[PDB]
């Protein structure tokens, strides 16, 4: 009957939960869900695909990577039950009673945010989002306390695999949950910076790193601070760092784009390909091999699971589109009679490749969130295009019907209905092709009435003079409706979108920073097209009680800090003004009782 | 296991001999090996054990006559700071009333856990129908003897405090201050160090620094350095 | 210091035979350096003072906007140049048509007659197979390809939406 | 500076939170008096 | 002047309440507050942890 306080009270007074919980009563708890609730529908669907079948629902919701193998530890089962039924207070209590608190809070946030998109009732989804925010905040606060206590133990707790959540680490759970507040925590960012700089000191200046990159002999001076075989060790320490690999790949990709533009603009003749074009082919082949390597590593797990994880990333989708278009263009080019088609396909492919440069911007705090802003402004443009199309259809068809151009065919009609009014939004207003007061009047038609000759090549040879004032009035109305009103509607949408992301830019950038550091932590140290050496090395490499003690010690440390955190919260609550006033009222009641008894 | 520095808390066990299970191995006049998984066995989380031999093999309760004296001697001991000693009573049978009386005649502060029943609740409810109460917490008890014992205990309320779940450090400080009595400023250094460690500002400012107690610089230098660090 | 150093360099170049034009250009830029120094006078006024700080920070905003502008200009300009295939191709002309000409479209300078073959005359001004057209612009290339010119027009349509509105208003926000 | 600090302390003493705290403490004293009077 | 040394120590270690106390106990209060603000804002740009 959802009485969290009595649940807390009865357990605290000696009710052995380990003996109490049985599969019968555990199944009976799920029977208490409302008939119209989301969890009831999910359970019925799972059964249609009697045990509760909660594990199937967890697999459907969270996926194989993060879903607990329910049943799990009664506290974990009770927490899962409370989360599925959206019992906020009982879920909080079950979290504070159990272990694995940071990973459990992250997993709870993930589950609640997954189920929040699946509910038809808006305020129920709002409740789930609010509870997910609360659990994320609890995890952030607990990890902050743990990190302030001990950096090494906190780092070990952050990177350990939790059996309760599909052996996912805290960072993977936060990534799935889109918990940007967890990535923005100082301990997480410090650990990520330490991973990013590898064996170099994170305090190394950027200018020193660039100077050492372009002048390798400077590595062995005191310019770079590191935290014969000794020479090789320092060489591999500098060149193996994720930040150095990132810089090398930036240089490599800029050179690849320069070579692509050079070939496209100079060397791409109908004759068979030359040396530079073959070099471009080999470079693209190594890029495809790198994408294959990333796919085979998931970006033990089944091959399809790794491939789905790889395909879930939008940058990998952009890479696949670019490489597929490159392959199509090259195939068309090598075929007789398809040279021009290959040219155009590769021209669009260059645009696809160049916009991929935006991923580099996420290394910078200023440039990072602007990419998200642009991505959302694109959806704003998509929605604005409906109004633009309606107004263009109305105005263009009316103007074309009034002018009655004699050179009428489907491409010309489309050009004068859509293309010509569209350019008026950007200041291209051909008055001499629409206003008969600026044309010469000639008998260039056989129909009755007066006609005029526009000078434009695509304006029609002869237009009607009848009611041309109405054409001019339509132009006047168009310049007000489209150039100002609709454009500024789109701009207001842009401003709203910009403000939404600018409010939380640091969270966005720190999530992006985690993604970038994770991406370049596992990439080969050689940049393309030399990356073929690393791929060949990998191919040859392939083709030819204490742990649980440390786990228990770490979990005990974490639970002790959770207890300190909860005690601090309770002590802060006790000293609030509302609780002081309540206790004052109660003690005045006691004083009244004393006065009554004294007479 | 959760501590990040050096060890500071030690658990000491005082137990009667003959009750220790598998004690046969301990007889070697040296690191002994103890098969505790086989009377009650010793708890492996403790760092030292005192096995008081009552002579009566298997008898329970014979270790009080040494435990109380050890507590008193530690209470009277100096490091040169006095070492405060406190007793915590979770619950008890009729024998815990005798234990509390003996620990009160030889001054030792005591804490009574409220809501845990037994002798703890029996002593707590009279602090803050007397025969009815004694029967309520001791259904089989001898009402007259228990009443006399409870009155003898309540003669000296200054050594008793009630701890309620509705914190620990504040109650400990209050109990330690309540039984001090003297005013030479040497008997309050221990309480001052405890207040510094537990951040009990109001307790120190109210109880410890009053015009009765004649402090001066050398008393407070160490506490000032502790508060600075 | 920058203004005085540039003035000294310009005067030194001017007094040297064969460096008169270099001194002229250096002093022309030096005049700009000297004139922007007038902004320090504005700080005496409560209304004009903080606007200088606002302009100084808006300059950093422009610096960061230039990365997006450069990426989009590279993509669009190289695609358009590859589609049009101008016969008068050399590095300065290619740079002008890849960077300079698309940049002026942001400010309403749209040369339709140099990009749309429906507005050009069709002539056999090339030796390669296919159909070609002659743009009238001096720096537009003598002869461009007619193949898939609808795609050039579509790229222009997309450019006018991405650059003139979206990126400019990102900078404005 | 001493006048400034005294003014700040006097403003803090008269806040509602401190008034409520002192009221609670004086109610505790009244409860002590009532307990001692029986 | 022990108060100045204690204030500097508290400012370097980011002990807010003890720095305030050492400021209110010492002399040269206006210049000390300005110097404390300067030192804290200098050290704020030198720290890796954002909070
Ligand atoms: C492009 C826009 C900028 C850009 O790259 O943006 C990247 C997209 O990632 C790609 O890989 C996007 C790659 C797009 C590539 C487009 C190529 C276009 C040029 C070639 C074609 C040119 C035209 C050729 C026409 C040819 C006709 C034949 C940002 O990706 P992100 O993952 O960093 O950011 C996401 C993203 O913006 C999501 O859409 C957004 O969610 P919603 O806004 O709710 O959809 C996330 O925010 P929330 O967490 O709040 O939900 C963001 O956090
Ligand atoms: Ca990829
Ligand atoms: Ca003492």
Swiss-Prot record, chain E:
Organ and tissue specificity: Widely expressed with a high expression in intestine and prostate. In brain, it is both expressed in whole cerebral arteries and isolated vascular smooth muscle cells. Prominently expressed in Purkinje fibers. Expressed at higher levels in T-helper 2 (Th2) cells as compared to T-helper 1 (Th1) cells. Expressed in keratocytes.
Variant or mutagenesis effect after changing residue 41 to A: Becomes insensitive to decavanadate's voltage modulation effect
UniProt modification remark: Phosphorylation by PKC leads to increase the sensitivity to Ca(2+). Sumoylated. Desumoylated by SENP1.
Entry superkingdom: Eukaryota
Family indicated by similarity: Belongs to the transient receptor (TC 1.A.4) family. LTrpC subfamily. TRPM4 sub-subfamily.
Free-text function comment from the UniProt entry: Calcium-activated selective cation channel that mediates membrane depolarization. While it is activated by increase in intracellular Ca(2+), it is impermeable to it. Mediates transport of monovalent cations (Na(+) > K(+) > Cs(+) > Li(+)), leading to depolarize the membrane. It thereby plays a central role in cadiomyocytes, neurons from entorhinal cortex, dorsal root and vomeronasal neurons, endocrine pancreas cells, kidney epithelial cells, cochlea hair cells etc.
Noted disease: Progressive familial heart block 1B: A cardiac bundle branch disorder characterized by progressive alteration of cardiac conduction through the His-Purkinje system, with a pattern of a right bundle-branch block and/or left anterior hemiblock occurring individually or together. It leads to complete atrio-ventricular block causing syncope and sudden death. Erythrokeratodermia variabilis et progressiva 6: A form of erythrokeratodermia variabilis et progressiva, a genodermatosis characterized by the coexistence of two independent skin lesions: transient erythema and hyperkeratosis that is usually localized but occasionally occurs in its generalized form. Clinical presentation varies significantly within a family and from one family to another. Palmoplantar keratoderma is present in around 50% of cases. EKVP6 inheritance is autosomal dominant.
Subunit structure of this chain's protein: Homotetramer.
UniProt protein name: Transient receptor potential cation channel subfamily M member 4
Gene source species: Homo sapiens (Human)
């Amino acid at each position: 009957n959802d009485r969290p306080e009595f649940v807390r009270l009865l357990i605290s007074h000696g009710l052995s939960l380990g003996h109490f919980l049985t599969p019968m009563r555990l199944a009976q708890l799920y029977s208490a869900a409302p008939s119209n609730s989301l969890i009831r529908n999910l359970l019925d669907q799972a059964s249609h695909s009697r045990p509760p079948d909660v594990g199937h629902v967890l697999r459907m919701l969270l996926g194989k990577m993060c879903a607990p193998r329910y049943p799990s530890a009664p506290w974990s089962d009770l927490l899962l039950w409370a989360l599925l039924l959206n019992r906020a207070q009982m879920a909080m209590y079950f979290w504070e009673m159990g272990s694995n608190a940071v990973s459990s809070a992250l997993g709870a946030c993930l589950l609640l945010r997954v189920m929040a998109r699946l509910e038809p009732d808006a305020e129920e989804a709002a409740r789930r989002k609010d509870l997910a925010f609360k659990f994320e905040g609890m995890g952030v606060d607990l990890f902050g306390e743990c990190y302030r206590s001990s950096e090494v133990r906190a780092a070990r707790l952050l990177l350990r695999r939790c059996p309760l959540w599909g052996d996912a680490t805290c960072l993977q759970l936060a990534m799935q949950a889109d918990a940007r507040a967890f990535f923005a925590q100082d301990g997480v960012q410090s650990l990520l910076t330490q991973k990013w700089w590898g064996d170099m000191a994170s305090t190394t200046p950027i200018w020193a790193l660039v100077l050492a990159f372009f002048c390798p002999p400077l590595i062995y001076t005191r310019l770079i601070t590191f935290r014969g075989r000794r020479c090789l060790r320092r060489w591999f320490h500098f060149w193996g760092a994720p930040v150095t690999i990132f810089m090398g790949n930036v240089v490599s990709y800029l050179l690849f784009l320069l070579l692509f533009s050079r070939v496209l603009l100079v060397d791409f003749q109908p004759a068979p390909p030359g040396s530079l074009e073959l070099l471009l082919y080999f470079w693209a082949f190594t890029l495809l091999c790198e994408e294959l390597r990333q796919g085979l590593s998931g970006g033990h797990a089944s091959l399809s699971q790794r491939l789905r994880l790889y395909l879930a990333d939008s940058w990998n989708q952009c890479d696949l589109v670019a490489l597929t278009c490159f392959l199509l263009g090259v195939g068309c080019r090598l075929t007789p009679g398809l040279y021009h088609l290959g040219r155009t396909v590769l021209c669009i492919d260059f645009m696809v490749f160049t916009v991929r440069l935006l991923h580099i911007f996420t290394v910078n705090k200023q440039l990072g969130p602007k990419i998200v802003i642009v991505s959302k402004m694109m959806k704003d443009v998509f929605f604005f295009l409906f109004f633009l199309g309606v107004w263009l259809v109305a105005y263009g068809v009316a103007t074309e019907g009034l002018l009655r151009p004699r050179d009428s065919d489907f491409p010309s009609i489309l050009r004068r209905v859509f293309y010509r009014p569209y350019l008026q939004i950007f200041g291209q207003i051909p008055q001499e092709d629409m206003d008969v007061a600026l044309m010469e009047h000639s008998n260039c038609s056989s129909e009755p009435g007066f006609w005029a000759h526009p000078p434009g090549a695509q304006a029609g040879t002869c237009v009607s003079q009848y009611a041309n004032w109405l054409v001019v009035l339509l132009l006047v109305i168009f310049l007000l409706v489209a150039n100002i009103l609709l454009v500024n509607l789109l701009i207001a949408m842009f401003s709203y979108t910009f403000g939404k992301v600018q409010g939380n830019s640091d969270l966005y950038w720190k999530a992006q920073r985690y993604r970038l550091i994770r991406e370049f932590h596992s990439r080969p140290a050689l940049a393309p097209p030399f990356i073929v050496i690393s791929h060949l090395r990998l191919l040859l490499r392939q083709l030819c009680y204490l742990s649980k003690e440390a786990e228990r010690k770490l979990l005990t440390w974490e639970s002790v800090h959770k207890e300190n955190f909860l005690l601090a919260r309770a002590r802060d609550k006790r000293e609030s003004d509302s609780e002081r006033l309540k206790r004052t009222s109660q003690k005045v009641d006691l004083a009244l009782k004393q006065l009554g008894h004294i007479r | 296991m959760a501590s990040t520095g050096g060890t500071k808390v030690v658990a000491m066990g005082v137990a009667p001999w003959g009750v220790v299970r598998n004690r046969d191995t301990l007889i070697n006049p040296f690191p002994a090996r103890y098969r505790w998984r086989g009377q009650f066995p010793l708890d492996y989380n403790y760092s030292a054990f005192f096995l008081v031999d009552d002579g009566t093999h298997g008898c329970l309760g014979g270790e009080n006559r040494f435990r109380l004296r050890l507590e008193s001697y530690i209470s009277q001991q100096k490091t040169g700071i006095d070492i405060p000693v406190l007793l915590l009573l979770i619950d008890g049978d009729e024998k815990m009333l005798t234990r509390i009386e003996n620990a009160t005649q030889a001054q030792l502060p005591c804490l009574l856990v409220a809501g845990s029943g037994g002798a703890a609740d029996c002593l707590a409810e009279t602090l803050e129908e007397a025969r009815d109460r004694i029967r309520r917490f001791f259904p089989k008890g001898d009402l007259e003897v228990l009443q006399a014992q409870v009155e003898r205990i309540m003669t000296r309320k200054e050594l008793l405090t009630v701890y309620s779940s509705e914190e620990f450090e504040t109650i400990v400080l209050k109990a330690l201050v309540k039984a001090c009595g003297s005013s030479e400023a040497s008997a309050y250094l221990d309480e001052l160090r405890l207040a510094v460690a537990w951040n009990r500002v109001d307790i120190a400012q109210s109880e410890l620094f009053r015009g009765d107690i004649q402090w001066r610089s050398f008393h407070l230098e160490a506490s000032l350095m502790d508060a600075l660090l």
